[PDB]
C-alpha cells in the first residue's frame, strides 16, 4: 500500500462531493466516504481509516460491484493499482472422454486498501469497464 503519497498527482486528489467545511471544527478533520460492496464482502479497516483516493475503489470509490464474482491466483503486481491473476480450468474434450489444462490471464484492479503479493489468491468482483482490458476489481484477499 504505502499510502501512495496521496497528494502526488498534478490535480488535487479528493472524493467528489465530499465537502470538509473549514468554518466548523470537529473530529475526523478529513471527511471520508465509504460503502460496503455487498454480497457479504466486508470493508477492510484500511479503506475506512485510510487516506488513499482511488476513485476505482469498490469501497471508497464511484464503481459498483455487480455481475460475476471470480477467484484467481496473482501472477503480476507490476502495474500501478492493477494486477494480473491466472484462472486455471479443465477443458473437456468429449472424443477422448477426458480433460486438458487451460488458463486465462485476467487483469484486475487492486485498491490501496488491499496488499497483494505474487502467488496470493484473491476474489475479484465485476465492475464497469475501468480500462481497455480491466473489467474486475479486487474485493477480498485470501493469502499473504
Amino acid at each position: 500500500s504505502t499510502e501512495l503519497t496521496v497528494q502526488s498527482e498534478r490535480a488535487f486528489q479528493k472524493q467528489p462531493h465530499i465537502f470538509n467545511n473549514p468554518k466548523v471544527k470537529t473530529s475526523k478533520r478529513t471527511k471520508r466516504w465509504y460503502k460496503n460492496a455487498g454480497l457479504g464482502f466486508k470493508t477492510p479497516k484500511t479503506a475506512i481509516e485510510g487516506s488513499y483516493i482511488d476513485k476505482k475503489c469498490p469501497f471508497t470509490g464511484l464503481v459498483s460491484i455487480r455481475g460475476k464474482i471470480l477467484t484467481g491466483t496473482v501472477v503480476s503486481t507490476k502495474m500501478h493499482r492493477t494486477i494480473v491473476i491466472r484462472r486455471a480450468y479443465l477443458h473437456y474434450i468429449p472424443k477422448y472422454n477426458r480433460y486438458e489444462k487451460r488458463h486465462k490471464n485476467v487483469p484486475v484492479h487492486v485498491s490501496p486498501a488491499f496488499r497483494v503479493q505474487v502467488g496470493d489468491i484473491v476474489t475479484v468482483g465485476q465492475c464497469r469497464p475501468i480500462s481497455k482490458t480491466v473489467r474486475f476489481n479486487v474485493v477480498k484477499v485470501s493469502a499473504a
Binding site: 490535480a11 488535487f12 467545511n21 473549514p22 487483469p107
Partner: protein, 187 residues
C-alpha cells in the same frame, strides 16, 4: 470521422485486428470546443435522439459557488492560471473542467457586507439584528481574506463548457486552496 470504436488499435496480446464494420455513426466523436474568454458565442449540437447539446465558445461570465457560505454568484472570468492536464491551456486561456481561474470577486464582496457586515480586506436597526445573529462566522480564513484586497479569487471550473455551454465552478478553500497555491508560487 472521429470514431470511438475499438476494432481499431490492437488487443492486449498485441495482435492487429482486421478491418470489419465500416465506421458506424453510433460510435462517432467530434472536435473539442476549446472555449475562450470574452464575447460569448455558443453553438448548438444535435446529438443522438434529439438531445440538443451546447458547444460553448468565448464564455464571458460564470456561476461560481462559495461552498462554506452556501451562496452562488454570477461573476466575470479573468483568465486561467493552472491546469492539471496541459500547461498550454493555461497559456492559451482555454476553459475546461478542473481549470483554476481568477474571478471578479466583486459579487462575493458585496454579499459579505450585506450578510455579515464587518469588513472585507483592509443603517436601520433591522440590519444589525441580523448582523449580531450572523456573527462569530465572519472569520473565514487568512488565505481567502487576502484575495479580496487584490479583487480576484482562485476558483476551479467544475463544469464542462464544451458539453453544457456553461462555465460554473467553486471558490478554492481550505486544503484544496493550499495545494494549488504551492503549485502557483513555485519558481
Amino acid at each position: 470521422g472521429i470514431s470511438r470504436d475499438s476494432r481499431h488499435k490492437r488487443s492486449a496480446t498485441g495482435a492487429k485486428r482486421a478491418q470489419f464494420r465500416k465506421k458506424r455513426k453510433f460510435e462517432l466523436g467530434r472536435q473539442p470546443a476549446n472555449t475562450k474568454i470574452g464575447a460569448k458565442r455558443i453553438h448548438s449540437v444535435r446529438t443522438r435522439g434529439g438531445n440538443k447539446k451546447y458547444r460553448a465558445l468565448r464564455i464571458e461570465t460564470g456561476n461560481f459557488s462559495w461552498a462554506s457560505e452556501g451562496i452562488s454568484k454570477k461573476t466575470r472570468i479573468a483568465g486561467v492560471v493552472y491546469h492539471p492536464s496541459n500547461n498550454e491551456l493555461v497559456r492559451t486561456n482555454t476553459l475546461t473542467k478542473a481549470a483554476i481561474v481568477q474571478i471578479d470577486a466583486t459579487p462575493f464582496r458585496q454579499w459579505f457586507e450585506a450578510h455579515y457586515g464587518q469588513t472585507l480586506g483592509k443603517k436601520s436597526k433591522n440590519a444589525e439584528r441580523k448582523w449580531a445573529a450572523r456573527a462569530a462566522s465572519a472569520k473565514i480564513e487568512s488565505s481567502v481574506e487576502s484575495q479580496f484586497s487584490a479583487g480576484r479569487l482562485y476558483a476551479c471550473i467544475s463544469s464542462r463548457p464544451g458539453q453544457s455551454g456553461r462555465c460554473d465552478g467553486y471558490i478554492l478553500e481550505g486544503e484544496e486552496l493550499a495545494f494549488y497555491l504551492r503549485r502557483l508560487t513555485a519558481k
